[PDB]
mmCIF file of C-alpha atoms and ligand atoms in Angstrom:
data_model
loop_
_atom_site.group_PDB
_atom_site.id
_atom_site.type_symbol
_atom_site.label_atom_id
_atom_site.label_comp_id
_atom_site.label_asym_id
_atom_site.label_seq_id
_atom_site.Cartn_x
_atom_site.Cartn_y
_atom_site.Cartn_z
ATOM 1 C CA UNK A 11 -23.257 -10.153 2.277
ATOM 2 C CA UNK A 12 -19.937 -11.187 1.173
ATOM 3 C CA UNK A 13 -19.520 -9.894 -2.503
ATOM 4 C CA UNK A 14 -18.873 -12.084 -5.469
ATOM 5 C CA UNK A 15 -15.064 -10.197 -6.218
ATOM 6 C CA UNK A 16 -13.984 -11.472 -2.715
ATOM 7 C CA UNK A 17 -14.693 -15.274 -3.576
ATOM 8 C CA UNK A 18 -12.446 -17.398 -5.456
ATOM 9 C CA UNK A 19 -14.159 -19.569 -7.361
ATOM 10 C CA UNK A 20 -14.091 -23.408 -7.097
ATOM 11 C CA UNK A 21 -12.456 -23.426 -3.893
ATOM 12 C CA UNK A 22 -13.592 -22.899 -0.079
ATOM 13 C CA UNK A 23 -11.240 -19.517 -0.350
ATOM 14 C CA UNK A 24 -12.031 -15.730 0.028
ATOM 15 C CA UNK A 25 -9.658 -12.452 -0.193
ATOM 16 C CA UNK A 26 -9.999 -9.780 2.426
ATOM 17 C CA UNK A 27 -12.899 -10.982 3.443
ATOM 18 C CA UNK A 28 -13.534 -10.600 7.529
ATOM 19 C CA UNK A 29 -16.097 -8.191 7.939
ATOM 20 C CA UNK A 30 -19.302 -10.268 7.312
ATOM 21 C CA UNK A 31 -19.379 -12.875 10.117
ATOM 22 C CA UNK A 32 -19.231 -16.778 8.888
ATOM 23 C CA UNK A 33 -18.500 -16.928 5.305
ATOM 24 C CA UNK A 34 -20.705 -20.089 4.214
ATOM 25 C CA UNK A 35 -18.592 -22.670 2.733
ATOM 26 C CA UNK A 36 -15.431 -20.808 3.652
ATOM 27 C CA UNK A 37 -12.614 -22.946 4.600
ATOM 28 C CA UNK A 38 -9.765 -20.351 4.223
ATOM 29 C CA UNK A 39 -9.260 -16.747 4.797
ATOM 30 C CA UNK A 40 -6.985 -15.178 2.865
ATOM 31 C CA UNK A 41 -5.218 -11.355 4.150
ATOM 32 C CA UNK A 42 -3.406 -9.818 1.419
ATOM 33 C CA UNK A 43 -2.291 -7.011 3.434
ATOM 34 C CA UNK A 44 -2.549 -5.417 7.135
ATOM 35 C CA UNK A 45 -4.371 -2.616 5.826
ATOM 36 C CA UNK A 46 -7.972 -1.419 7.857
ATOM 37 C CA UNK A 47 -10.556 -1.647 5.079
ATOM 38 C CA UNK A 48 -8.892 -5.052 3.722
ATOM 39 C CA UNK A 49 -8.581 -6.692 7.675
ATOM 40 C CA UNK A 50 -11.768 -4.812 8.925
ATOM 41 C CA UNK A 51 -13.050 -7.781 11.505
ATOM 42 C CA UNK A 52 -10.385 -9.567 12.511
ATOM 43 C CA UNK A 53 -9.420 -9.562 16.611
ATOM 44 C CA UNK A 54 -8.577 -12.290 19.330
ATOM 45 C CA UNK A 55 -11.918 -13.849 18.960
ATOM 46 C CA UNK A 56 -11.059 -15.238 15.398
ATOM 47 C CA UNK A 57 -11.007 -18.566 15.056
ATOM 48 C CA UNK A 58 -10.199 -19.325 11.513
ATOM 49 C CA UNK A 59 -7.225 -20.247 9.324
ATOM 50 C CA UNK A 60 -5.555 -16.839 8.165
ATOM 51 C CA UNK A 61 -3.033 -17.309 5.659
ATOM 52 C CA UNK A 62 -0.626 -14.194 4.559
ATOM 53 C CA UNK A 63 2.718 -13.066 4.638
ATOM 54 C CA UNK A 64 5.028 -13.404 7.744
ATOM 55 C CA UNK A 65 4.583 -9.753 8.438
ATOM 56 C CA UNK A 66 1.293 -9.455 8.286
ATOM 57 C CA UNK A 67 1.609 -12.723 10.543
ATOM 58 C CA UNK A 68 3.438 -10.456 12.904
ATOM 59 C CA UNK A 69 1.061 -7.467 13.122
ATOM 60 C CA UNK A 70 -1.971 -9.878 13.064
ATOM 61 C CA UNK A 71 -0.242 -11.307 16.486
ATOM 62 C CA UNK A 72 1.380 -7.928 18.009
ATOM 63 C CA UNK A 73 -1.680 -5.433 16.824
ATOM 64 C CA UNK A 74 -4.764 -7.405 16.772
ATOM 65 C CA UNK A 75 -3.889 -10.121 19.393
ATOM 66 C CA UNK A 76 -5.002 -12.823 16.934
ATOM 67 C CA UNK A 77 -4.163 -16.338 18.506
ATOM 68 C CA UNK A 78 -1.003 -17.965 17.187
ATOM 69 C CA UNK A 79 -2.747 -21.230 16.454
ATOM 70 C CA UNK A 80 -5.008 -19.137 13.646
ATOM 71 C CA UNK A 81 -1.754 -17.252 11.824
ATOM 72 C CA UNK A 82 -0.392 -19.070 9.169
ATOM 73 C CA UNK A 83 2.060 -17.627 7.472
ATOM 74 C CA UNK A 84 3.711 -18.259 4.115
ATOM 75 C CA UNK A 85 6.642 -17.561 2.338
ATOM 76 C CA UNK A 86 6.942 -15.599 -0.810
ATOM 77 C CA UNK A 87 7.809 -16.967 -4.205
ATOM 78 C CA UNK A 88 7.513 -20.821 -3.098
ATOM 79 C CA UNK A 89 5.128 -23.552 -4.559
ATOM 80 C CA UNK A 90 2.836 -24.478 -1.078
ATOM 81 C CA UNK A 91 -0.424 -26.252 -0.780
ATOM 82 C CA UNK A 92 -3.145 -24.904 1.109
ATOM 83 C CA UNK A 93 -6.644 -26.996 1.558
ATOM 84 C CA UNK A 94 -5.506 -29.433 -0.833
ATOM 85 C CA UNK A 95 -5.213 -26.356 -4.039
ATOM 86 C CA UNK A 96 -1.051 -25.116 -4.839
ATOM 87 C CA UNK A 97 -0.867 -21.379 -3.970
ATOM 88 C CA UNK A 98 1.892 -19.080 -4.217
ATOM 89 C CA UNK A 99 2.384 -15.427 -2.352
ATOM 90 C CA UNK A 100 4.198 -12.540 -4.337
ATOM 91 C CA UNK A 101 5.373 -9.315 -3.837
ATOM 92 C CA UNK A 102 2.381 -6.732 -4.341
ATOM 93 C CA UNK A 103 4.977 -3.573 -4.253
ATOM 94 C CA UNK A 104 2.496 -1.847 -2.083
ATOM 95 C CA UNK A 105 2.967 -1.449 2.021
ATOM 96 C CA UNK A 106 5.727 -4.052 4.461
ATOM 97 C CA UNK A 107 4.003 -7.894 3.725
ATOM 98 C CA UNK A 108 1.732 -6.735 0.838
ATOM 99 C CA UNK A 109 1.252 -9.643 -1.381
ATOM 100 C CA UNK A 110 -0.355 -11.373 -4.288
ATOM 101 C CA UNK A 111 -2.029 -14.511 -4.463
ATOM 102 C CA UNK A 112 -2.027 -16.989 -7.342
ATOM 103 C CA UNK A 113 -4.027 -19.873 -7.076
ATOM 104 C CA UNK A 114 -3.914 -23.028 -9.373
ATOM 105 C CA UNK A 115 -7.392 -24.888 -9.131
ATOM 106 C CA UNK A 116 -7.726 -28.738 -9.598
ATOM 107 C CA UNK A 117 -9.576 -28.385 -13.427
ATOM 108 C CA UNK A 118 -6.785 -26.197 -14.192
ATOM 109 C CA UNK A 119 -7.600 -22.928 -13.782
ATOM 110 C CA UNK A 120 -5.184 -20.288 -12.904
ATOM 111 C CA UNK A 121 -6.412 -16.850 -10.955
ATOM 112 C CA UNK A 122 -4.070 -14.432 -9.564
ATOM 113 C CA UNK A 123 -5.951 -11.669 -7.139
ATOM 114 C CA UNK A 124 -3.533 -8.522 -7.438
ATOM 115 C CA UNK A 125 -4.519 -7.333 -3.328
ATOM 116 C CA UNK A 126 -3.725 -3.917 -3.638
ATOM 117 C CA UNK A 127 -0.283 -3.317 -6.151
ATOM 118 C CA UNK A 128 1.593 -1.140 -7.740
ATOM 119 C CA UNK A 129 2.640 -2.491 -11.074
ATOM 120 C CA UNK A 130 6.220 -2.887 -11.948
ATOM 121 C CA UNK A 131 8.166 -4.177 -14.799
ATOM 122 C CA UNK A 132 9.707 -6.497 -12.361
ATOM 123 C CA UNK A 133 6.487 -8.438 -12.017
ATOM 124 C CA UNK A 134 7.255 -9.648 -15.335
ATOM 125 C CA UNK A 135 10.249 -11.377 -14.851
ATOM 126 C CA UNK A 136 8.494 -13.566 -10.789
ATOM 127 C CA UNK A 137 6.839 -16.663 -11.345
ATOM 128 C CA UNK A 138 4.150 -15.468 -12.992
ATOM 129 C CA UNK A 139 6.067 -15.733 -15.945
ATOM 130 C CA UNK A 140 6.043 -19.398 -15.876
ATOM 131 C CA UNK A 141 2.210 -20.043 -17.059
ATOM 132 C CA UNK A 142 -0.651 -18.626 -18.628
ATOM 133 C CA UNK A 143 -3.185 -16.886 -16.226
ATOM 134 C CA UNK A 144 -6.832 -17.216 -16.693
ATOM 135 C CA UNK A 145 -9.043 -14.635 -14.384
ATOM 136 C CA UNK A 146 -7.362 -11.405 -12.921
ATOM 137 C CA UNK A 147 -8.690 -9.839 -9.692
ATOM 138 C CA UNK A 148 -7.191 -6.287 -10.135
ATOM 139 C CA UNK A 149 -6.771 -3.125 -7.757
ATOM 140 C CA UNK A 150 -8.311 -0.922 -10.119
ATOM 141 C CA UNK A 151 -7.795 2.324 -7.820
ATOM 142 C CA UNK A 152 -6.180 4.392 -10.063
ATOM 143 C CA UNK A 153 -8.082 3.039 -13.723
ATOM 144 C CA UNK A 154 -8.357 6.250 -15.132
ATOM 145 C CA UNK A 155 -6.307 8.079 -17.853
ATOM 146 C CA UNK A 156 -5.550 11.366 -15.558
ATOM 147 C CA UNK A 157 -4.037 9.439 -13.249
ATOM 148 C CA UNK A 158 -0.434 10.106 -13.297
ATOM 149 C CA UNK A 159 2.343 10.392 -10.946
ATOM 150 C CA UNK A 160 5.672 9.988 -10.477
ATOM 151 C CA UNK A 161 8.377 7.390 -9.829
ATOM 152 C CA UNK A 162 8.401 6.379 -6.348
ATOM 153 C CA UNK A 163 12.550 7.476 -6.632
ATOM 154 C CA UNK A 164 11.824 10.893 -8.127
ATOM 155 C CA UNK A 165 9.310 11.645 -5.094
ATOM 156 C CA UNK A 166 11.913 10.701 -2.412
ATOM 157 C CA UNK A 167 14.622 12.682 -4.387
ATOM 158 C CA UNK A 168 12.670 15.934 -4.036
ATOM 159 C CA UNK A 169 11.436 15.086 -0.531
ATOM 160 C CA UNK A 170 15.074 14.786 0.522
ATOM 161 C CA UNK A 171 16.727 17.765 -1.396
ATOM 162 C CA UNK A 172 14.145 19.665 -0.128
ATOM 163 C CA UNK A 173 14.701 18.563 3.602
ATOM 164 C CA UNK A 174 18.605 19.081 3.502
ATOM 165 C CA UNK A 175 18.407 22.039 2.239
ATOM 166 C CA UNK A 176 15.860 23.431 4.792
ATOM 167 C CA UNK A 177 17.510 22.711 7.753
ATOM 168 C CA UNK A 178 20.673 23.339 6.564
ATOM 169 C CA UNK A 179 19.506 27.053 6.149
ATOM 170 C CA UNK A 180 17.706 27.053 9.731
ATOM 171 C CA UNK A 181 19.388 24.091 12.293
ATOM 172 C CA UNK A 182 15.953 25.307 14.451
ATOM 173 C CA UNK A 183 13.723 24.077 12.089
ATOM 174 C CA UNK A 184 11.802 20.505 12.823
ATOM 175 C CA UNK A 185 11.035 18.200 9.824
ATOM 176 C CA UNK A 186 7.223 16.220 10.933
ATOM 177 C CA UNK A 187 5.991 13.588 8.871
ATOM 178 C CA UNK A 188 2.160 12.291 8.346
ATOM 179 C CA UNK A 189 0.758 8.864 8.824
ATOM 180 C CA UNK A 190 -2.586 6.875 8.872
ATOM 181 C CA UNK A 191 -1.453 3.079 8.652
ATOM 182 C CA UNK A 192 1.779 1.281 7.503
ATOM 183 C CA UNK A 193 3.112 2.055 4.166
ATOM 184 C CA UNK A 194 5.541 4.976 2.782
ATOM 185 C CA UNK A 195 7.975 4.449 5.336
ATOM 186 C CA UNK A 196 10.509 5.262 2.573
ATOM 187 C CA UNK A 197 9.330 8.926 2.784
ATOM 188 C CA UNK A 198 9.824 9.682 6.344
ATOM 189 C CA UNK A 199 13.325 7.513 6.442
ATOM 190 C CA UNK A 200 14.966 8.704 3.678
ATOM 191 C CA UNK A 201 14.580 12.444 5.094
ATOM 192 C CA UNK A 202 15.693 11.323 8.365
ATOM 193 C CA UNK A 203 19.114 9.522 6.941
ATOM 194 C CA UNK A 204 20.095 12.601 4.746
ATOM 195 C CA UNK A 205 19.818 14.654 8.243
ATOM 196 C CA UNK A 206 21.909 12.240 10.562
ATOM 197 C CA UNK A 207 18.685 11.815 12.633
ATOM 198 C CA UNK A 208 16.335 8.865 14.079
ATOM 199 C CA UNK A 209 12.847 9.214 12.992
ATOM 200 C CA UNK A 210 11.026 10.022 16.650
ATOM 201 C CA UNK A 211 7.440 8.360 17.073
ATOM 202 C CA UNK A 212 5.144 7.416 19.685
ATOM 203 C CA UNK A 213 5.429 3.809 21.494
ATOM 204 C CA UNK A 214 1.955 2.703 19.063
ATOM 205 C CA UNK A 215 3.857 3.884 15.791
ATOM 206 C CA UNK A 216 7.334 2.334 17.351
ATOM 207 C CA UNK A 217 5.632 -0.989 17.875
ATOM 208 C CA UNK A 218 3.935 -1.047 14.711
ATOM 209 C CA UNK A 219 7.323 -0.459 12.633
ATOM 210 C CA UNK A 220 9.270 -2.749 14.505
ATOM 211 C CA UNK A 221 6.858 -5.986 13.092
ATOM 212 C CA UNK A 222 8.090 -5.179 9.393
ATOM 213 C CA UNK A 223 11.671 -6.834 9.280
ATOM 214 C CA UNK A 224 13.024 -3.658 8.262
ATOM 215 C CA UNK A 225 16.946 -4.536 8.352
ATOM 216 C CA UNK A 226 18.786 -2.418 10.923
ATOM 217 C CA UNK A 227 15.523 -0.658 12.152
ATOM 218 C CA UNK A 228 16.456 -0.194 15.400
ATOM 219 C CA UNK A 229 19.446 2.397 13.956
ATOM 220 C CA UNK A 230 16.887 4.101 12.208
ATOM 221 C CA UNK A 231 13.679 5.040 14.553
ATOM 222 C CA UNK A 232 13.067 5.781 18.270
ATOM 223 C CA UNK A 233 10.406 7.076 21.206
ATOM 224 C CA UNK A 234 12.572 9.796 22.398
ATOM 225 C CA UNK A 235 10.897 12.636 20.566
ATOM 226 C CA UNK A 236 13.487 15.400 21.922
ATOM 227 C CA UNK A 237 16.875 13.685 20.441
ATOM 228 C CA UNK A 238 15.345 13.556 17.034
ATOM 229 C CA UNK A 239 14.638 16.277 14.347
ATOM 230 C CA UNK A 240 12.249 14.393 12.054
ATOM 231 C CA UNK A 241 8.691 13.515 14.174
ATOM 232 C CA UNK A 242 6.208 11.174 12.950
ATOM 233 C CA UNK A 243 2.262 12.152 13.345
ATOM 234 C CA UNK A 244 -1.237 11.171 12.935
ATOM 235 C CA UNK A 245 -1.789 12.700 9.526
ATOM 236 C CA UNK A 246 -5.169 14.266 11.115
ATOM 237 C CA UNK A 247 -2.814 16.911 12.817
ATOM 238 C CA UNK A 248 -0.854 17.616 9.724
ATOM 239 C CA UNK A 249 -2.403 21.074 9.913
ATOM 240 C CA UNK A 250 -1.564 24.210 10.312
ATOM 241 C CA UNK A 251 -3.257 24.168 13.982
ATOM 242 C CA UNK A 252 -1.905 21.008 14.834
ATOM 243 C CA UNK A 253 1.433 21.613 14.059
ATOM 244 C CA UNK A 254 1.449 25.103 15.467
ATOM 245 C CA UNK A 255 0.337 22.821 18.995
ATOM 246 C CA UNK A 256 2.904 20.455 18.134
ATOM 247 C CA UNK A 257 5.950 22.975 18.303
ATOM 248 C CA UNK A 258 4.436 24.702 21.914
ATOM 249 C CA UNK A 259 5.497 21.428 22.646
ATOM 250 C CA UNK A 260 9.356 20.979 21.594
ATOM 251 C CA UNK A 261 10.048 23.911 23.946
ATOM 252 C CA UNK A 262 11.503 26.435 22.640
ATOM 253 C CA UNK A 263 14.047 23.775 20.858
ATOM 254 C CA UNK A 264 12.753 23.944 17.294
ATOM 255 C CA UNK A 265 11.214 27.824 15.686
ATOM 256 C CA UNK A 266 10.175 26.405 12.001
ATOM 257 C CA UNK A 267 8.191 23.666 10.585
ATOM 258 C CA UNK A 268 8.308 22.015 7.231
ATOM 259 C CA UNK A 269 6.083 19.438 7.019
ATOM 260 C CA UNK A 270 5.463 16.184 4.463
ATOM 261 C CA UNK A 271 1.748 15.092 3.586
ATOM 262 C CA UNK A 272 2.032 12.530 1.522
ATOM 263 C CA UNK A 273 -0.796 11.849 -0.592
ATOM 264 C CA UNK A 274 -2.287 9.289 -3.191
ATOM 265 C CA UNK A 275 -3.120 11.684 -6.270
ATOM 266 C CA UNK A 276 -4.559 14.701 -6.252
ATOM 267 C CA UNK A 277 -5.592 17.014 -9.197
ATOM 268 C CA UNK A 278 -2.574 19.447 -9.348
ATOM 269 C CA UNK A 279 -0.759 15.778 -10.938
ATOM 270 C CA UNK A 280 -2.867 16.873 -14.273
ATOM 271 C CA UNK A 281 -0.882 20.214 -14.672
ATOM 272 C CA UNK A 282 2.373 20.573 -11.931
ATOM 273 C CA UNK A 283 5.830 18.366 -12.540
ATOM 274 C CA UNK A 284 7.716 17.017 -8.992
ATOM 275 C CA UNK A 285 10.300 19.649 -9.792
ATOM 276 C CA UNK A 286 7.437 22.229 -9.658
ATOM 277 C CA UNK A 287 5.486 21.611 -6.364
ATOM 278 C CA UNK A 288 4.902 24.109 -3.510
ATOM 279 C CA UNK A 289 3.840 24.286 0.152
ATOM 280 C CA UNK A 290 1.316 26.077 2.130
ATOM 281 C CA UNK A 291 2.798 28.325 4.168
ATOM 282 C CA UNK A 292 1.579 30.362 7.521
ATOM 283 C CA UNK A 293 4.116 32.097 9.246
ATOM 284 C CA UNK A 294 7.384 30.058 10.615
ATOM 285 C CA UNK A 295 5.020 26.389 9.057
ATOM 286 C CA UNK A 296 5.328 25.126 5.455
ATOM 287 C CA UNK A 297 3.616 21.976 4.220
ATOM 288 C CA UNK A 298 4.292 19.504 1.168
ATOM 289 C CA UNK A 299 1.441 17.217 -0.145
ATOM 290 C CA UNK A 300 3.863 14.938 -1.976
ATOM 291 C CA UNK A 301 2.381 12.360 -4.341
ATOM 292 C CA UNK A 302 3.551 9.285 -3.539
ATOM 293 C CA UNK A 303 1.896 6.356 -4.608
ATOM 294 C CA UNK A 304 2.039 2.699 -3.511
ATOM 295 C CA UNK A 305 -0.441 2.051 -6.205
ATOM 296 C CA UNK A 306 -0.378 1.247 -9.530
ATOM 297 C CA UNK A 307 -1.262 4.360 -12.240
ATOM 298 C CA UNK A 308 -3.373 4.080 -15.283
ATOM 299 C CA UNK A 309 -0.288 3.837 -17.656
ATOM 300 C CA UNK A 310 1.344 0.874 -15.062
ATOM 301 C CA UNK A 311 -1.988 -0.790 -14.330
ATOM 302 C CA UNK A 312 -2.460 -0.793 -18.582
ATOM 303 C CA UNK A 313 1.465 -2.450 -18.955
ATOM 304 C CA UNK A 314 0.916 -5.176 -16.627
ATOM 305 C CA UNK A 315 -2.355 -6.272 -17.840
ATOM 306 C CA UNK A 316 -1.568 -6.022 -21.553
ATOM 307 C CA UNK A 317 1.819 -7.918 -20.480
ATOM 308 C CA UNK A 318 -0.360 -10.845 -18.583
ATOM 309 C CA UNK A 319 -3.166 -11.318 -21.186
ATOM 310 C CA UNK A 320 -5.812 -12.976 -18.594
ATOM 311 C CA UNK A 321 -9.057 -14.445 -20.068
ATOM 312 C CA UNK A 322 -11.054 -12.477 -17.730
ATOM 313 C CA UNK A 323 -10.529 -9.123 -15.381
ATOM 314 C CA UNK A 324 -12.616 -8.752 -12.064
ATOM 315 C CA UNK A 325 -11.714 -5.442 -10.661
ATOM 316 C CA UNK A 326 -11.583 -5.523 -6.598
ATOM 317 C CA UNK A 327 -11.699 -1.143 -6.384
ATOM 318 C CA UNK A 328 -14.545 1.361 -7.170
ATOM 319 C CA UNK A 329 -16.783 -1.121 -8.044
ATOM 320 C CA UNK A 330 -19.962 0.698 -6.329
ATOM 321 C CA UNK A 331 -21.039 2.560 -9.012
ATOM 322 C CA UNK A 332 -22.273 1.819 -12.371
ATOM 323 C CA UNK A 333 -20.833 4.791 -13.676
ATOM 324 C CA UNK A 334 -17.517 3.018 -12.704
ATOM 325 C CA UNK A 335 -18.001 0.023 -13.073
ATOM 326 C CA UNK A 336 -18.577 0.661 -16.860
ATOM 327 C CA UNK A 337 -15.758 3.048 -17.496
ATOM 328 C CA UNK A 338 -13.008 0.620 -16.380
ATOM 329 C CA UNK A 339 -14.807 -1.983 -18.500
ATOM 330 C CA UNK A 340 -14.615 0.243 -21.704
ATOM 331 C CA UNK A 341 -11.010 0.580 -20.361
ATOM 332 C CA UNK A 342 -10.045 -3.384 -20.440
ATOM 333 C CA UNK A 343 -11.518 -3.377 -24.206
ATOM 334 C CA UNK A 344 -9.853 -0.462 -25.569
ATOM 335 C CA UNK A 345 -6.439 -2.558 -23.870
ATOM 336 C CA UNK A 346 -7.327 -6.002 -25.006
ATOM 337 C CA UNK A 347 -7.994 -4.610 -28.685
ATOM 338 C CA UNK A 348 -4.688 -2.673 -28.891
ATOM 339 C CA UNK A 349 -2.930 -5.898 -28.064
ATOM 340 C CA UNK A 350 -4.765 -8.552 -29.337
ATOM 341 C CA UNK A 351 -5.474 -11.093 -27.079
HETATM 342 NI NI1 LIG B 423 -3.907 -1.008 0.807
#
């Protein structure tokens, strides 16, 4: 059944919320962002109020065939009323149309559910300035004190450095790029600029990126795999064996791989520095895992929430376990007693 963390209470609302048939008493469906495990149920056959970003809007239309009639989208950082209750959308810094959600009940209440974020300073200074929030639902991914990583900027530094230089030393060699969903387009764009190239996809991918309002996107990617030098694939064949397929099929135009995996965290964070990272390498193929992150890490998660003060936390990730469940709560105390609230 629909768990407690994806109702809001007081309201006919839930969050992320379309993978359990009829929600009773729901008059509302919130979609924070077009990711599978947060729109898991949604199709053509919905016939619901949706209410998200416009592009989410767009991929809920162009990806999912939702019916028009059932998309409503809002726009960010602007006072609306939804249902009779004032809501306002902001930016999540997490994937193209990720947002939060703050909702201001009728007794007075005021919850903001985080979707999935990564914290920034910059949150500090949006709307949520304005007034005092009372219950947090919070992306708690990352709510652990090994969890580090970098900037997003030092990441896409090294990614790019490390590009130029490559194929500066070999013009044969073909840069290929991982992905599983929308999100990190940075990483495979960035790479592709700093080599004078369009970022070469298939027409699902293609579609896909052209629903995000990137400006000037259509100087940027393309479906003609042979006129570009950075390729886009499923990160499933971001594998030695599928990338040794993938260049039998360039022809003879390309005799070297290096090839970009990027990551959430993963346990070399705890000892290795960006400026220290190394591939796998077999024969003429070398691949990065590169960690960057489009959520928030311990250290960010702790700022924000020590910044916003709420009443009460309701984390949204890892809540399965009681193991878990208990840690992050000895977490929020440790954070609430260091700053007093
Ligand atoms: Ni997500």
């Amino acid at each position: 059944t629909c768990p407690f963390y994806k109702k809001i209470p007081g309201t006919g609302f839930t969050v992320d919320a379309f993978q359990y048939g009829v929600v009773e008493g729901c008059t509302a469906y919130f979609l924070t962002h077009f990711h599978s495990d947060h729109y898991a149920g949604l199709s053509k056959h919905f016939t619901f109020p949706v209410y998200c970003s416009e592009i989410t809007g767009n991929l809920l239309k162009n990806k999912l065939h939702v019916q028009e009639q059932y998309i409503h989208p809002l726009p960010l950082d602007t006072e609306c009323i939804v249902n009779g209750v004032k809501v306002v959308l902001l930016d999540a810094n997490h994937c193209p149309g990720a947002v939060m959600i703050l909702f201001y009940l009728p007794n007075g209440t005021v919850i903001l559910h985080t979707g999935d974020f990564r914290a920034d300073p910059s949150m500090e200074r949006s709307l949520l300035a304005d007034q005092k929030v009372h219950m947090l639902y919070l992306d708690t991914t990352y709510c652990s004190p090994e969890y580090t990583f970098p900037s997003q900027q030092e990441v896409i530094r090294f990614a790019i450095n490390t590009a130029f230089e490559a194929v500066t030393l070999n013009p044969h060699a073909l840069v290929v790029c991982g992905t599983y969903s929308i999100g990190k387009e940075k990483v495979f764009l960035a790479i592709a600029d700093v080599l004078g190239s369009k970022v070469g996809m298939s027409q699902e991918k293609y579609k896909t990126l052209q629903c995000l309002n990137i400006p000037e996107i259509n100087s940027l990617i393309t479906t003609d795999m042979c006129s570009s030098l950075v390729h886009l694939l499923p990160m499933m064949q971001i594998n030695f064996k599928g990338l040794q397929s993938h260049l039998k099929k360039c022809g003879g135009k390309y005799n070297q791989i290096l090839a970009f995996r990027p990551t959430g965290w993963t346990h070399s964070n705890k000892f290795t520095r960006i400026a220290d990272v190394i591939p796998q390498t077999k024969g003429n193929i070398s691949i990065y895992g590169i960690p960057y992150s489009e959520h928030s890490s311990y250290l960010e998660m702790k700022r924000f929430v020590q910044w916003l003060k709420p009443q009460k936390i309701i984390p949204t990730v890892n809540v399965g376990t009681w193991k878990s469940r208990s840690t992050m709560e000895k977490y929020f105390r440790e954070w609430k007693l260091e700053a007093g609230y």
